[PDB]
Design a protein around this ligand. Structure first.
Ligand SMILES: CCCCCCCCCCCCCCCCCC(=O)OC[C@H](COP(=O)([O-])OCC[N+](C)(C)C)OC(=O)CCCCCCCCCCCCCCCCC
Ligand SMILES: CCCCCCCCCCCCCCCCCC(=O)OC[C@H](COP(=O)([O-])OCC[N+](C)(C)C)OC(=O)CCCCCCCCCCCCCCCCC
Ligand SMILES: CCCCCCCCCCCCCCCCCC(=O)OC[C@H](COP(=O)(O)OCCN)OC(=O)CCCCCCCCCCCCCCCCC
Ligand code: SF4
Lengths: 93, 70, 175, 155, 297, 98, 83, 57, 88
């Protein structure tokens, strides 16, 4: 032993050096709301275990109008077009 | 209906036509009728060099025949 | 003057070499030798190396240079480097170009530079020979013999490349 | 003439800026139906030189369509800043231009112009497809009424 | 004199590429219950110019993170290599009669990956790099199929000289002898062409490439006849054939959904490649089996 | 012996020095390896084509098909080294000090 | 019998591309062995002259070699003109 | 009352597998898409010439 | 002369076209290496058209078929041990 080698730790007995700490690269992607596939307003934030996905968080709310809150201050007839504006795909239903 | 695509494609057709057209004629213009003698190997090249040296006008595309020898 | 054209190809070949050998960013080092890869074919082309020159562009340039740029596009060190970021690479950059330029000037001065090998700095066109090549391209007919006279190299190369496949997957298998 | 050459160049510079401008969306709400329901064969807009395309770096006019909530407000602003110049925004729908139905609610900004400098306003709840097609036509006519190179030469 | 031909090989193509955009939209028009651009000049004839004239007038918004060097160099090569592609084409008499034109054609096609890779890497955006990462992996993947297919069909020509291709076909279109490889090549050229500010140049490059790759297939399989005394007949036949192939590029671009990434490689490695290997094996044994090996000279 | 032989000779020599002068990046050094063998490739072609050694024209191709083939390992060891450590830095290439 | 029939039936039902490739490659591997024209292929390939036909000295003992190029002696390739 | 959709029990006979193998080997469902689209092309469009003509109300 | 001219004009036209456009206004890595390893083997396979015109075609037939066999074996090996199966 010398001053230079006064800190050289002996090799691990199994030759397997201590594994490195968490080095994952779980990338976070935002698929919208500008993305056309997001269908206008969708804030999909979600994890990329490489190219493979483990959890998708659909942060809905991008179009949140408190419809029921306004419905509280209108009569039944006045509140009717709100439902007409709810599913603007199959509106009459 | 669809006959309106033809004005769209005709311009490209004519535009695509010029390169092959232009190469076809200026080769005749540069090489005097015959095509630019292709030299894919050494033989065709030194055939051309012999033609250029024998032309006297230092031009391969000028060809001299039986009239050149007396 | 295209008298010394092969000189021009030769000199820019090495300045591209000095570029990446100066150790810039790997991606910028990559482009620093693709230009050297590009010019090297020109030297071979001017010597009659049609297929061999096009090999550099196809399997060398258009082949494995892509995956090295691909690898750098994978690694992406926390900041992708550049010639500007490092000041040592600039010092080596100027050193290589100046060393080449002075030796070239010495080479074109007395044509008798004895560095490692004694050599003549005479024109590149001089070393060429005479005699027609017939109808066969010697560069193409020679390599076509791989299936006629290269009856041994195909065996070893074919075996080695297959051995190349197993080693690649086995070590990348990650136990 | 000195004014004539800048006049011809100005027209040439903006003659197709009103015919090659390509719309951009955000497609918030029911106005996002007429957004591309005009891209449907009936009220063809691809013929008008316009064609829908997101590509926020490579588009000319964005047709803001739907209800503008406060929660999305950063997203629109960052899109409009990323938008290259020249850029125009079209407020389709009563909700987009002036809040419309939800003007009094807590989670919608009262009109898009409070957030982005807003060009031609096309009204409607929703604007029936050709109404925006008419509105887009007005925008192109507005493009002609421009003296870009003329103003520069006057200075 | 030579300078005129080089310009005469570039300018009409650039005009043709300009009018390809109008063709791309409008042949998809009546194929969509649509009309296509008809307001910009007669039948949209001014749309090619209009789009090619307004894009340059837009400012070149480049992000600060993007290195101006690579962000400009990558588009530059994306066109220049795609412009020399047109050169060795055996349009009656090609510009450069390279003895190895096939290698010259394919090798320069191998450098089109660099335009995408650098312009995606320099962008320094998470969406950009994965897109560049995706595109480079796909194009180099189909490179091996591109070369193997060429080796198989060209074996019956005689040598890599593109000028010899017309002589080989002559009486019979070579699609008749390698139709299993023909659709193999047509899918391959679709994948490489990336087709299922400083931007008009890029779109022009990726659209000039569509015409040429279609032209490369036209000279390869859909042959023609060439009279030495009237090359114009070969010109019209050649441009018509490659025009139809470009139309097909537009035909299928509006007839299919997209390919998922995994299937994008599954189709090639596990389906296209082993079948291509067998066909190449078939196309080498057969000329030997029938004593029909073409002459090298 | 002309300059075309010499110019690429020192092209290898600066490449040989480059690989032997690790800065921080083994990727950069790896990129120096195949450039270094390219100098071998060009010299091989230059001599062989100059002397019309017809049968030896195969050799420059097969030089590529192994140097490029081993370059796969050069990345493959690198592509695995960059996993555990997180980078290609040769500074971390000293875990085996003892 | 039944084993190969079911297996081939199985392969063509799930992987038609794979069996087609193997069939073509497996086919191409065997035709040259029994090919009736490969013998011609070498003959015509050996009948293509790239180099000059170097004359040999005339001293008798070789009546087989012709004197004129049009002389009857020497090899004849009427087969080449016909096939 | 209801009807199924996905279930097909594709028959494994020599003739049937030939059609499936042919469909995969020489694409036929894809060319069907080409035929449908081309038939669409040779049909007059539904576009309206605004403002020279505007849709019904 | 002609070739250097041809690679000169197009790059100059490209540069001016950007001048008017600038001043006027593991698994993914693994599949790439497999491409390279096959890419090298197609290099050996390229000279085939001239190789078919050799005098000893029988030896050429064995090796040309041999190289494609190793193309198949390398692909088949990679396929059966996952390999060409891209990790999803
Ligand atoms: C394994 C399959 C490939 C090798 C066997 C088939 C080819 C044999 C061959 O080319 O032999 C060349 C020669 C015999 O030559 P040949 O007589 O067949 O052909 C001579 C051709 N000229 C005249 C042009 C040179 O044999 C060898 O080189 C032995 C190669 C190694 C064999 C054992 C490997 C283990
Ligand atoms: C003595 C004879 C010797 C030779 C005989 C050779 C055998 C007989 C012929 C073999 C089949 C034909 C060759 C292979 C073709 C199919 C390859 C393949 O993988 O197919 C399955 C593949 C995949 O089919 P799949 O998705 O059903 O899956 C098949 C099986 N796996 C899962 C393993 C892949 O089909 C395709 O890829 C379809 C095309 C996709 C791309 C979209 C564009 C298509 C455009 C079509 C219209 C235009 C055509 C233009 C043609 C050219 C014009 C100039
Ligand atoms: C004429 C006489 C011969 C007739 C034909 C006989 C052979 C028939 C072979 C049938 C296919 C092979 C066997 C089989 O069924 O393999 C299925 C399997 C599919 O794998 P995969 O698609 O990944 O699906 C499973 C995992 N999800 O397959 C696999 O997993 C392995 C796939 C390997 C593919 C190798 C392709 C090599 C190149 C093509 C062949 C070239 C010629 C080779 C020499 C042939 C000599 C006879
Ligand atoms: S204006 Fe009418 S149609 Fe448009 S978003 Fe508002 S409520 Fe919906």
């Amino acid at each position: 032993p010398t001053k230079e080698t006064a800190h050289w730790k002996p090799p691990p007995w199994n030759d397997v050096d201590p594994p490195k700490d968490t080095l994952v690269s779980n990338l976070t992607l935002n698929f919208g709301p500008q993305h056309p596939a997001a269908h206008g307003v969708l804030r999909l934030v979600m994890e990329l275990s490489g190219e493979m996905v483990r959890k998708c968080d659909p942060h809905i709310g991008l179009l949140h109008r408190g419809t029921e809150k306004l419905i509280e201050y209108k009569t039944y007839l006045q509140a009717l077009p709100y439902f007409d504006r709810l599913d603007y795909v199959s509106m009459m239903c | 209906m669809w006959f309106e695509i033809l004005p769209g494609i005709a311009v490209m057709a004519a535009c695509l036509f010029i390169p092959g057209m232009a190469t076809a004629h200026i080769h005749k213009f540069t090489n005097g009728g015959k095509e630019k003698r292709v030299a894919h190997f050494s033989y065709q090249w030194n055939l051309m060099e012999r033609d250029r040296c024998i032309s006297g006008v230092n031009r391969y595309h000028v060809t001299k025949g039986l009239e050149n020898i007396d | 003057m295209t008298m010394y054209i092969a000189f021009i190809l030769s000199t820019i070949f090495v300045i591209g070499f000095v570029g990446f050998s100066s150790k810039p960013s790997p991606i910028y080092g990559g482009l620093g030798l693709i230009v050297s890869g590009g010019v090297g074919c020109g030297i071979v082309l001017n010597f009659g190396g049609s297929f061999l020159g096009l090999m550099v562009f196809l399997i060398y340039l258009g082949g494995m240079l892509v995956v090295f740029g691909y690898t750098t596009a994978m690694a992406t060190e926390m900041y992708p480097e550049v010639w500007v970021s490092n000041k040592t690479v600039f010092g080596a950059f100027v050193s290589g170009l100046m060393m080449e330029f002075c030796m070239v000037y010495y080479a074109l001065k007395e044509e008798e530079v004895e560095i490692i090998f004694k050599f003549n700095g005479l024109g590149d066109w001089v070393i060429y020979d005479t005699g027609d090549s017939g109808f066969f391209s010697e560069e193409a007919m020679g390599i076509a013999a791989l299936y006629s006279y290269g009856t041994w190299l195909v065996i070893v190369t074919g075996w080695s490349l297959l051995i190349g496949v197993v080693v690649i997957m086995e070590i990348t298998r990650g136990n | 003439r000195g004014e004539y050459v800048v006049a011809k160049l100005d027209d040439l510079v903006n003659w197709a800026r009103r015919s090659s401008l390509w719309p951009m969306t955000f497609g918030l709400a029911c106005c996002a139906v007429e957004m591309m329901h005009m891209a449907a064969p009936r009220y063809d807009m691809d013929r008008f030189g316009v064609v829908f395309r997101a590509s926020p770096r490579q588009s000319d006019v964005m047709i803001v369509a739907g209800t503008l909530t406060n929660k999305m407000a950063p997203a629109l602003r960052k899109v409009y800043d990323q938008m290259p110049e020249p850029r125009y925004v079209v407020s389709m729908g009563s909700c987009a231009n002036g809040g419309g139905y939800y003007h009094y609610s807590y989670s919608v900004v009262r009109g898009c112009d409070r957030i982005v400098p807003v060009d031609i306003y096309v009204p409607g709840c929703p604007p029936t497809a050709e109404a925006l097609l008419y509105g887009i036509l007005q925008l192109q006519r507005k493009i002609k009424r421009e003296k870009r190179l003329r103003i520069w030469y006057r200075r | 004199m030579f300078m005129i031909n080089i310009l005469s090989l570039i300018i009409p193509i650039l005009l043709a590429v300009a009018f390809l955009t109008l063709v791309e939209r409008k042949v998809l028009g009546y194929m969509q219950l649509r009309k296509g651009p008809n307001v910009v000049g007669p039948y949209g004839l001014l749309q090619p110019i209009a789009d090619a004239l307004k894009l340059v007038t837009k400012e070149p918004l480049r992000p600060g993170t993007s290195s101006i060097s690579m962000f400009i160099i990558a588009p530059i090569l994306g066109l220049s290599l795609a412009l020399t592609m047109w050169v060795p084409l055996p349009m009656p008499y090609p510009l450069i009669n390279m003895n190895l034109g096939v290698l010259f054609m394919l090798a320069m096609s191998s450098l089109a990956v660099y335009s995408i890779l650098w312009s995606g890497w320099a962008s320094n955006s998470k969406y950009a790099l994965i897109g560049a990462l995706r595109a480079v992996a796909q194009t180099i993947s189909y490179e091996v199929t591109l070369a193997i297919i060429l080796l198989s069909v060209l074996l019956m020509n005689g040598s890599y000289t593109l000028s010899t291709l017309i002589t080989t076909q002559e009486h019979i279109w070579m699609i008749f002898t390698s139709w299993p490889l023909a659709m193999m090549w047509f899918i391959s050229t679709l994948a490489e062409t990336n087709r299922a500010g400083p931007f008009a140049m890029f779109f022009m490059a990726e659209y000039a490439n569509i015409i040429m790759m279609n032209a490369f297939t036209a000279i390869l399989f859909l042959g023609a006849s060439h009279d030495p005394h009237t090359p114009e007949l070969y010109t019209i036949n050649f441009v018509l054939k490659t025009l139809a192939l470009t139309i097909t590029f537009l035909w299928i671009r509006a007839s299919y959904p997209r390919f998922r990434y995994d299937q994008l490689m599954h189709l090639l490695w596990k389906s296209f490649l082993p079948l291509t290997l067998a066909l190449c094996m078939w196309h080498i044994s057969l000329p030997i089996m029938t004593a029909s090996i073409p002459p090298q000279s | 012996m002309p300059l075309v032989y010499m110019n690429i000779i020192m092209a290898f020599a600066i490449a040989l020095a480059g690989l032997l002068m690790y800065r921080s990046h083994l990727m950069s050094s790896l990129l120096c390896l195949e450039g270094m063998m390219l100098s071998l490739f060009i010299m091989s072609t230059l001599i062989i084509l100059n002397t019309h050694f017809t049968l030896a024209n195969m050799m420059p191709i097969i030089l590529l098909v192994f140097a490029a083939c081993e370059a796969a390992l050069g990345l493959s060891l690198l592509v695995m080294v960059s996993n555990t450590y997180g980078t290609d830095y040769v500074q971390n290439l000293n875990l085996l000090q003892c | 019998a039944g084993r190969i029939a079911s297996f081939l039936k199985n392969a063509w039902a799930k992987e038609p591309v794979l069996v087609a490739s193997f069939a073509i490659g497996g086919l191409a591997i065997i035709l040259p062995s029994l090919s009736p024209y490969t013998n011609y292929a070498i003959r015509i390939n050996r009948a293509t002259p790239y180099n000059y036909p170097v004359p040999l000295r005339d001293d008798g003992n070789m009546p087989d070699v012709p004197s004129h190029p049009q002389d009857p002696q020497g090899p004849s390739l009427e087969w080449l003109k016909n096939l | 009352t209801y009807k199924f959709v996905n279930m097909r029990e594709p028959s494994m006979d020599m003739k049937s597998v030939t059609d499936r193998a042919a469909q995969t080997l020489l694409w036929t469902e894809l060319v069907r898409g080409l035929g449908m689209t081309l038939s669409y092309l040779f049909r007059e469009p539904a576009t309206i010439n605004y403002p020279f003509e505007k849709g019904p109300l | 002369m002609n070739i250097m001219l041809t690679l000169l004009t197009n790059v100059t036209l490209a540069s001016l076209l950007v001048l008017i456009a600038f001043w006027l206004p593991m698994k993914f890595f693994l599949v790439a290496i497999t491409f390279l390893l096959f890419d090298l083997e197609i290099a050996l396979l390229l000279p085939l058209p001239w190789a078919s015109q050799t005098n000893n075609l029988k030896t050429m037939l064995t090796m040309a078929l041999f190289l494609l066999i190793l193309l198949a074996a390398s692909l088949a090996y990679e396929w059966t041990q996952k390999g060409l199966e891209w990790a999803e």
